[PDB]
Design a protein around this ligand. Structure first.
Ligand SMILES: Nc1nc2c(ncn2[C@@H]2O[C@H](COP(=O)(O)OP(=O)(O)NP(=O)(O)O)[C@@H](O)[C@H]2O)c(=O)[nH]1
Ligand SMILES: Nc1nc2c(ncn2[C@@H]2O[C@H](COP(=O)(O)OP(=O)(O)NP(=O)(O)O)[C@@H](O)[C@H]2O)c(=O)[nH]1
Ligand SMILES: [Mg+2]
Ligand SMILES: [Mg+2]
Lengths: 166, 166
């Protein structure tokens, strides 16, 4: 069957693991548990197509650095995740974007910009500024909450549809 | 606030009204009630943007004909709906597509192809053939059921994101 190799990237603590576990296992994890590298494989049906989601959940820390090159080369699409209450994670998106473009030798890679933790009232990144950034990259912007499950299937399925139209 | 002028088109009986009422009023209508023309206006928040959805629900019958030109000219994005158990509704998509391109003087209009009634086991249009058609148009393909609410928010919100990136 068709397999889609998705990679979730972004700064430490933005909720990359919580979004992936909400999608795969249907629950919100709320504890401190830094990722090294986890993969999840799940057979699903998306718009009637039977497929397998092979998802790589990555570390937010640069002990990795050029160690990111390997997984970026094999990833077909990327969720670029920041937290709406963390301005530094939003500014860090530019560095993941440029690294992915450089390892894949391409200016248009299937990618979705995801603003997570949208359940929080202490917002520091306005949706309008993230939407402007996404518009300049030519990619979709989706807001999510791994805590309420808002936007979670939407972010992953929009990324599968982006790979489909590449 | 930002307003998005969406138009739902497709052959008679494919579920254009049932998809729109599931989104606006949260229930599945199951009765015979042919549309002449209905509009629905709803303030919503999509990816943190406060906006108003102005949705026009149209007639599946050609007593309309060139009477479609007016609403197609004012629509910013279109959901093109067929039913997965009705082959003629699928083939009719080409005629709505070409009319919209002709009235808007454009080869790329914000549009989503929606295969509705995906809860039914008596399928006559394979997802793969609809996905191929959507790929040739350069637009997203989404399967929906107004009966279970699967895919309903996804189809309308993907169309708002398509207007956003035009
Ligand atoms: N309120 C709220 N908290 C969230 C959300 N997503 C994640 N969190 C919380 O934020 C913390 C970090 O989440 P985690 O998934 O571990 O982040 P990560 O990006 O995977 N971290 P790392 O890069 O080190 O692997 C946890 O306490 C988690 O519960 C969300 O949508 N809402
Ligand atoms: N099982 C199933 N039936 C559906 C679905 N959507 C619509 N229907 C049914 O199909 C019939 C027609 O739906 P309706 O919304 O009136 O279609 P329409 O496209 O709006 N017709 P018209 O163009 O004449 O205005 C109704 O009996 C409705 O309940 C669906 O997803 N699943
Ligand atoms: Mg993690
Ligand atoms: Mg109707």
């Amino acid at each position: 069957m068709t397999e889609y190799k998705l990679v979730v990237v972004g700064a430490g603590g933005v909720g990359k693991s919580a979004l992936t576990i909400q999608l795969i296992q249907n629950h919100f994890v709320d504890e401190y548990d830094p990722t090294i590298e986890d993969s999840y494989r799940k057979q699903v049906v998306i718009d009637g197509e039977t497929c397998l989601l092979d998802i790589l959940d990555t570390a937010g820390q640069e002990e990795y650095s050029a160690m990111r090159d390997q997984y970026m080369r094999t990833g077909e699409g990327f969720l670029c995740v920041f937290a709406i209450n963390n301005t530094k994670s939003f500014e860090d998106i530019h560095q993941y974007r440029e690294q992915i473009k450089r390892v894949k030798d391409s200016d248009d890679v299937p990618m979705v910009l995801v603003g997570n933790k949208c359940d929080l009232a202490a917002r520091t990144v306005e949706s309008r500024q993230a939407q402007d950034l996404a518009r300049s990259y030519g990619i979709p912007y989706i807001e999510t909450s791994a805590k309420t499950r808002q936007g979670v299937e939407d972010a992953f399925y929009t990324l599968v549809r982006e790979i489909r139209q590449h």
